[PDB]
Amino acid sequence: GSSGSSGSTMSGYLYRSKGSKKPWKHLWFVIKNKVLYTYAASEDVAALESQPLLGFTVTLVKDENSESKVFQLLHKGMVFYVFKADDAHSTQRWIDAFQEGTVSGPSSG
Numbered sequence: 624g625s626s627g628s629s630g631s632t633m634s635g636y637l638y639r640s641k642g643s644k645k646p647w648k649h650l651w652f653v654i655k656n657k658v659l660y661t662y663a664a665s666e667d668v669a670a671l672e673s674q675p676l677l678g679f680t681v682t683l684v685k686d687e688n689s690e691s692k693v694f695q696l697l698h699k700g701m702v703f704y705v706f707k708a709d710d711a712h713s714t715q716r717w718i719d720a721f722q723e724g725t726v727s728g729p730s731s732g
Contacts, residue, residue, distance in 0.1 A: 631653055631654060632720055633653070633717055633720040634651070634653040635651075635708075635709065635713070636651055637650065637652055637706050637717070638705070638706065638707040639704050640706075642705060643705075651663060651664060654720055657676050657677070659675070660673050676721060678699065679697065679703070680698065681694055681696055681697060682697055683695075684705065691711050691714060692711050692714045696721065
């Protein structure tokens, strides 16, 4: 329960990695139709890749660079790729953004 609503679920440059000690990758990402699309530039003409968050998972990682500003994209239980967010606040967003992506929301009403 925070932030208004004006734009896509989440969109911002992040750093992809296959784990620690691995080289980061500056790429653009977006969340649409509950799918994690890949990009290169904000003003891109087409997504580099597209991967649905159906069955996937997310979790916070200790990491060395950050303490709680970087997460990992789990898939079936195994880490698919790493992701670093600007600040902690952001991370949480991406996290919940990735968490609420695989799920469909809790039971209400």
